[PDB]
């Protein structure tokens, strides 16, 4: 399965999705800079509308514990 095919379900907790992401990211062998680009970009983009909304409110500069606690009720 390709990294672009990794997406969050409509009922799937973000948490279970983030695990899937760094597992597939774990099978990507690209430069770190590209993998940083993938992190800030693709993760949020394939996140579900309800959490996506939430993550837009965190702004930039956000870290994984704060994202992970931010989308917990969703």
């Amino acid at each position: 399965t390709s990294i672009l095919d990794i997406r969050q379900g409509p009922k799937e907790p973000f948490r279970d999705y983030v695990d899937r992401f760094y597992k597939t990211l774990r099978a990507e062998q690209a430069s770190q800079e590209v993998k940083n680009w993938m992190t800030e970009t693709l993760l949020v983009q394939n996140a579900n509308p309800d959490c996506k909304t939430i993550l837009k409110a965190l702004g930039p500069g956000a870290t994984l514990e704060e994202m992970m606690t931010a989308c917990q009720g969703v």
Binding site: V18, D19, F21, L64, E65, M68
Partner: protein, 147 residues
């Protein structure tokens, strides 16, 4: 790890498969539970950075946590470099170079270099510096993964 030989010198010896597997099994069974930290600490006795990356890289599963840890290890490493600036002028022929955050993380250093620093007189405890970062990052995880 770097262990003391019968002759009375410190030499490197490889870590054992049923030690490796015991590390695996702990993680399988007790996941993020606090008992993992003393357990880690015992199994990390006399361990190198290189052996510590081996242990972290051999994890399967819990990839959100594994990424959070990585990022903590780099933050703690960035902080090592900040707090300890590089030293004045060129490196002496008679001496060996001071470590950076990435040498502590094992990344920029070689094994023989990791053995130079630890076995040399005074010795520098680059294991114990990485160990605190691991334990600190373990607290972060434990606190998050509490429900």
């Amino acid at each position: 790890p770097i262990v003391q030989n019968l002759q009375g010198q410190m030499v490197h010896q490889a870590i054992s498969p049923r030690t490796l597997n015991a590390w695996v099994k702990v993680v399988e069974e007790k996941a993020f539970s606090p008992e993992v930290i003393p357990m880690f600490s015992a199994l990390s006795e006399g361990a190198t950075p290189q052996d510590l990356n081996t242990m972290l890289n051999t994890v399967g599963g819990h990839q959100a946590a594994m990424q959070m840890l990585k990022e903590t290890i780099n933050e703690e490493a960035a902080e090592w470099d900040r707090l300890h600036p590089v030293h004045a002028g060129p490196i002496a022929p008679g001496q060996m170079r001071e470590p950076r955050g990435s040498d502590i993380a094992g990344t920029t250093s070689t094994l023989q270099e990791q053995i130079g620093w630890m076995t040399h007189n005074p010795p520098i405890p680059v294991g114990e510096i990485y160990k605190r970062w691991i334990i600190l990052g373990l607290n972060k995880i434990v606190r998050m993964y509490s429900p």
